[PDB]
């Protein structure tokens, strides 16, 4: 009578039921394995931990992300996460009803192939569908025209859509994403005088980022200010009680999105990419696209990011254009929300790939029945 | 008319004059303080010993290393060592001419700040420059392209360089270094049946390591052999005349570099780190980097280490690649040698930081004029 909806992308796993206005299962896509000799007999432990388990005992566990840059690499672990998701988190047998999976655009074909197969073979899912995340963001916004900027953990991408009719030749994909920012920050902190190198420590850094970092509207003068004022400095307490103080790194990390070159990322800045996608669209619709830029994903949560995008685009764009950055509260869950909407849509029903069809056509059907 | 060149890193202090083909001052970066009640009046002793003095009377003295993991921690003692270096060893007033100091990449900013200041305030040095040790190794080799593996006492690091143009985003830093191997060995020896716990004893262990240990090209079968043959066993005479015999520990200690997990070091093995640095480089230059891997530093002196690196990389790398491990005699002094070269280079002259500039800009200049 319903369907499962989930954001099986990088970073976090979001899941719930169609029609729900919020995911209930929200936890890290992390698999952990111990790297020390277990001693106490009777400890009652396992050789694999997932999500919150992994975070809880990260000082012992070696943590891995099955998903890298939106690509599933460790299929065994991937399977485990889904297993956990369905039974431990959602408390539901997926075999009973259809599931909506999502992905970033432009992934190696095989990624879809195996996803499809697993759903049919391990989970024996009644029906399934793979959707592009950017598209889902529009459903969340309730708009048919705009440019979706989905910037998650492993991947950032741009999909211009005009009353539907997505324009594939204008889709941009950028590797530079939250995970890279995290890594970069680690190196910056070394400069400041703090060392983080274990995987657990990496996760701590992530926590820091998510709380303290913000986007400057004038990076140059932001640094000028930082260089002469403790007002930008801010303290933070680490898990063992130590207190650290962050200086100009608080905004230097975010800046990377606008200047990828900081990490050797040859590619253009996020606002240039955005702009370029528009440039690949016909002059007739460019205006509308400027009107509806839509933010989406966890990295769009940095304070001021909207304003920075606005400024940057304003500069690149022609004058008297209505540059509007749509960036609503809860945009962190945009995609998942959109999924709930789409799944609840009755019309959508005829897009499901059935097992029947799978059996007859094979896994290649995902490149024909499903967009 | 000249300049001082020194390796002020962990472990040993190397120093000499620009243009010299070998350092003349070579002694331990160790400061010693007595921990027993002096009795004989007229003994003519001091409350602080340095280098050879410290080694000579290590049974009495508490020995410390001002430098830990490439970071100066005890500045007072640091100062003392430099003092000793300049006047007792080199027999020269540093105030007369410029000095080249070195460091490992990615150190807490403050480390440079204080170094700079001290040189200008305590020693009043005419001019100075801080260089990355890895870079210097290439000058010693006479190459502009390669990957330098500088593996010293407190720190190991990787810096890929392509006709200059070092690639900062690919620089790796690894805590696992010779000092840790020493410590590890101590624990292993306990197993064998020998106890070493005093600081002086630690130094003895170091001596042992440097003479007897070697790298296996097949750790697994090396152990299989050891387990059934005294041919691997080798005797050694301790300072008090006792004779000890080393078994499989002779190669188990070195192995740690390839399997850091032995000491709880989550981090990847030294050959994996090397490889990964290459992976962070663009495909166009990767080939050249495989061709020029350059060993550097005291830990690259273990017999067979080159061959082991070769084998390991060969396995990780694509086939038909020219994996060449450059590991020349005297690579233990690589950095210092490179320093001599660089300092003698006339072009280099315009990189010196003058006191004038220091006074005007402040110590922060080290992050702008100096790389």
């Amino acid at each position: 009578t319903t369907a499962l909806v989930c954001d099986n992308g990088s970073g976090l796993v979001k899941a719930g039921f169609a029609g729900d206005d919020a995911p209930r299962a929200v936890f890290p896509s992390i698999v952990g394995r111990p790297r020390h000799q277990g001693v106490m007999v009777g400890m009652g432990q396992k050789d694999s931990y997932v999500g919150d388990e992994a975070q809880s005992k990260r000082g012992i566990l070696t943590l891995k992300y099955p998903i890298e840059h939106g690509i599933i690499t460790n299929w065994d672990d991937m399977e485990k996460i889904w297993h956990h998701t369905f039974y431990n988190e959602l408390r539901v047998a997926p075999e009973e009803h259809p599931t909506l999976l999502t992905e970033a655009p432009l992934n190696p074909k095989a990624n879809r192939e195996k996803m499809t197969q697993i759903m049919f073979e391990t989970f024996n899912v009644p029906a399934m569908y793979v959707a592009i995340q950017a598209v889902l963001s529009l459903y969340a916004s309730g708009r048919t025209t705009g440019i979706v900027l989905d910037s998650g953990d492993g991947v950032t991408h741009n999909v211009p859509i005009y009353e539907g009719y997505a324009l594939p030749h204008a889709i941009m994909r950028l590797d530079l994403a939250g995970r890279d920012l995290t890594d970069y920050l680690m190196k910056i902190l070394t400069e400041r005088g703090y060392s983080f190198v274990t995987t657990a420590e990496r996760e701590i850094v992530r926590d820091i980022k998510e709380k303290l970092c913000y986007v400057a509207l004038d990076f140059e003068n932001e640094m000028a200010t930082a260089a002469s004022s403790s007002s930008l400095e801010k303290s933070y307490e680490l898990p063992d009680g130590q207190v650290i103080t962050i200086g100009n790194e608080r905004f230097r990390c975010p800046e990377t999105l606008f200047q990828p070159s900081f990490i050797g990322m040859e590619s253009a800045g996020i606002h240039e990419t955005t702009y370029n996608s528009i440039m690949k669209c016909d002059i007739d619709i460019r205006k509308d696209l400027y009107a509806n830029n839509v933010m989406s994903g966890g990295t769009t949560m940095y304070p001021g990011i909207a304003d920075r995008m606005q400024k940057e685009i304003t500069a690149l764009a022609p004058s008297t254009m209505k540059i509007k950055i749509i960036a609503p509260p809860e945009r962190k869950y945009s995609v998942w929300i959109g999924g709930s909407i789409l799944a609840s849509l009755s019309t959508f029903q005829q897009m499901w790939i059935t097992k029947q069809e799978y059996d007859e056509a094979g896994p290649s059907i995902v490149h024909r029945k499903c967009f | 008319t000249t300049a001082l060149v020194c390796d002020n890193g962990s472990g040993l202090v190397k120093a000499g004059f620009a243009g010299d083909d070998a350092p003349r001052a070579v002694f331990p970066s160790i400061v010693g303080r007595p921990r027993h009640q002096g009795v004989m009046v007229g003994m003519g002793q001091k409350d602080s010993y340095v280098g050879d003095e410290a080694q000579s009377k290590r049974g009495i003295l508490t020995l410390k290393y001002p430098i830990e993991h490439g970071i100066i921690t005890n500045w007072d003692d640091m100062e003392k060592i430099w003092h000793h270096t300049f006047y007792n060893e080199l027999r020269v007033a540093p105030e007369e001419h410029p000095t080249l100091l070195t460091e490992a990449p990615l150190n807490p900013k403050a480390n440079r700040e204080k170094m700079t200041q001290i040189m200008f305030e305590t020693f009043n040095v005419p001019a100075m420059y801080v260089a990355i040790q890895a870079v210097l190794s290439l000058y010693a080799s006479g190459r502009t392209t390669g990957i330098v593996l500088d593996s010293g006492d407190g720190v190991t690091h990787n810096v890929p360089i392509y006709e200059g143009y070092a690639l900062p985003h690919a620089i790796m830093r690894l805590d696992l270094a010779g000092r840790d191997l020493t410590d590890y060995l101590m624990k292993i020896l306990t197993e064998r049946g020998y106890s070493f716990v005093t600081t002086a004893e630690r130094e003895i262990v170091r001596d042992i390591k440097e003479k007897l240990c070697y790298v296996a090209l097949d750790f697994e079968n090396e152990m299989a052999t050891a387990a059934s043959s005294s041919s691997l066993e080798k005797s050694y005479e301790l300072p008090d005349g006792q004779v000890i015999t080393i078994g499989n520990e002779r190669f188990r200690c070195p192995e740690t570099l390839f399997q850091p997990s032995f000491i709880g070091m989550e981090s990847a093995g030294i050959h994996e780190t090397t490889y990964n640095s290459i992976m962070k480089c663009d495909i166009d230059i990767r080939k050249d980097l495989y061709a020029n891997n350059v060993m550097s530093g005291g830990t690259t002196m273990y017999p067979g280490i080159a061959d082991r690196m070769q084998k390991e990389i060969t396995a990780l790398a694509p086939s038909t690649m020219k994996i060449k491990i450059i590991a020349p005699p005297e690579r233990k002094y690589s950095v210092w040698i490179g320093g001599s070269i660089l300092a003698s280079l006339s072009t280099f002259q315009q990189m010196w930081i003058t006191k004038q500039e220091y006074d005007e800009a402040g110590p922060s200049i080290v992050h702008r004029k100096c790389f």
Partner: peptide, 7 residues
């Protein structure tokens, strides 16, 4: 991936 990046 199997080319540029390490995926």
């Amino acid at each position: 991936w199997x080319a540029x990046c390490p995926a």
